[PDB]
């Protein structure tokens, strides 16, 4: 039927989306979105494309992300929905494109080399 899954990735933690299009309700760990991430600004980073577009009822997004902190969760969640739409519609190519997509980042924590008190700020003496 309808279920298009293009799997992004960008930071630790894994988001599989199988999306059947209806009313704008959002799930994560199969539990309601605002309430799971109650009290967060970074939660509304996600919410950005299921308002702003002029499509509200056209995406019921079913999301599961598993394993790491509160912060990480938003950036991945978002990417997927855009990428799926671009494949079908070439006119909503300017949906994917102008609303930001694609960073691995690749700057998630770095090597610890010896001597470092943290890893890279070598001792106060010697």
């Amino acid at each position: 039927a309808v279920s298009y899954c293009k799997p992004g990735r960008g930071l630790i933690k894994v988001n599989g989306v199988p999306i059947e299009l209806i009313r704008p309700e959002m799930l994560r760990l199969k539990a309601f979105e605002p309430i799971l991430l109650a009290g967060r600004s970074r939660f509304k980073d996600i919410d950005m494309r299921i308002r702003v577009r002029g499509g509200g009822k056209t995406s019921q997004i079913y999301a599961i992300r598993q394993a790491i902190a509160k912060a990480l969760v938003a950036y991945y969640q978002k990417y997927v929905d855009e990428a799926s739409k671009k494949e079908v519609k070439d006119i909503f190519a300017r949906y994917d494109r102008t609303l930001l997509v694609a960073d691995p980042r690749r700057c998630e924590p770095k090597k610890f080399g010896g001597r470092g008190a943290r890893a890279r700020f070598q001792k106060s003496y010697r």
Binding site: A1, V2, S3, Y4, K6, S84, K86, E87, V88, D90
Partner: protein, 380 residues
């Protein structure tokens, strides 16, 4: 079949033997194929009834492949054109409007090999990755191209360089590939039914960058490769690679059959394009820009395609133009020229429609144009 220039003799006994054997087999073959050549098309063509106006212009301009557009092939319905680009993306387009029906993120770079299936169902392309992955086309609204029962059909040692359908689905693959070998395959199972393996002149020892399927019964197929030969392989029987021409100085980086089936245009990377007649078995025509003044950035190069009538050869070159030729007459009918107003770029592919009404050109500048002719004669 191609006279060779006087070269200074060596006084070694052992070589003369070399000259002996080699020259004994090739001259004995040369006296049978050669005789059939009554005139040359150009000579005969002098007192021809004339051609009508040529009036192609870019009717519509299309865009959407991310990288450099490598390759195109038109669908038999006259309405789809595909196309594949280095980014790995494959797009099916309807050209007039230019709407995009489908897009699949396919896989490799070097995916320069998109073809349309005779049914219209499918595409194949592939390239770096060493496979061809198949894909059915559907009306479904959702459009996840990637899952709908695709399939890695093929495994080569090296990089898929060329693929083409025959007139049917059942023989969905005839390949010549970077792995060197050329191979016939059975579609569903993916087994290699037979392998054809021959030589340096002669077979292809090195990478097949193209092959093209003969037009009739499609009994044979001609391939082109780096070993500088145009070699037709007898697909139907014992598969002694059957009849060969090695006229070229340089890669025959391309090879396309006439709709008549009588000739093929050898477009090569060596600074000429040449036409070779498969039936008579000799070089019919030479396309070359002989004056020192008439030089472009690169002399003419990679790819060739035929009109439906066969009168015109529209060709892409690295230099960024098209020179349009009258095949029989030997004249240039015309120059087509496109885009930038300073600085070059490759035009890598150019492909005829199935009805013959129009052609699509893809270029490294990241744009596409479709040029068309309508009406018998000049418009209106």
């Amino acid at each position: 079949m191609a006279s060779v220039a006087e070269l200074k003799e060596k006084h070694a006994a052992a070589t003369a033997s070399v000259n002996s054997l080699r020259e004994r087999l090739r001259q004995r073959r040369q006296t049978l194929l050669d005789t059939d050549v009554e005139k040359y098309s150009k000579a005969q063509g002098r007192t021809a009834v004339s051609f009508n106006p040529t009036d192609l212009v870019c009717c519509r301009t299309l865009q959407g492949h991310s990288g450099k557009v490598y390759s195109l092939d038109w669908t038999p319905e006259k309405n789809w054109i595909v196309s594949a680009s280095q980014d790995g993306r494959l797009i099916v387009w309807n050209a007039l409007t230019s709407q995009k029906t489908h897009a699949i993120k396919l896989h490799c770079p070097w995916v320069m090999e998109c073809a349309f299936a005779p049914n219209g169902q499918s595409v194949a392309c592939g390239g770096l990755d060493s496979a061809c992955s198949i894909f059915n086309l559907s009306s479904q609204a959702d459009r996840d191209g990637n899952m709908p029962v695709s399939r890695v059909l093929t495994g080569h040692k090296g990089y898929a360089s060329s693929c083409q359908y025959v007139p049917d689905q059942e023989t969905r693959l005839i390949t010549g590939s970077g792995d060197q070998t050329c191979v016939l395959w059975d579609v569903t199972t993916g087994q290699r039914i037979s392998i054809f393996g021959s030589e340096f002149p002669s077979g292809h020892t090195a990478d097949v960058l193209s092959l093209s399927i003969n037009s009739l019964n499609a009994n044979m197929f001609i391939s082109g490769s780096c070993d500088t030969t145009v070699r037709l392989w007898d697909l139907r029987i014992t598969s002694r690679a059957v009849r060969t021409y090695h006229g070229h100085e340089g890669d025959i980086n391309s090879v396309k059959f006439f709709p008549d089936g009588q000739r093929f245009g050898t477009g090569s990377d060596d600074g000429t394009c040449r036409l070779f007649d498969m039936r008579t078995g000799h070089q019919l025509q030479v396309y070359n820009r002989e004056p020192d003044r008439n030089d472009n950035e690169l002399p003419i190069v990679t790819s060739v395609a035929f009109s439906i009538s066969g009168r015109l050869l529209f060709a892409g070159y690295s230099n960024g133009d098209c020179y349009v030729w009258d095949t029989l007459l030997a004249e240039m009918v015309l120059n087509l020229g496109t885009l930038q107003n300073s600085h070059e770029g490759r035009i890598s592919c150019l492909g005829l429609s199935s009805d013959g009404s129009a052609l699509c050109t893809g270029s490294w500048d990241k744009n596409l144009k479709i040029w068309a002719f309508s009406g018998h004669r000049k418009i209106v």
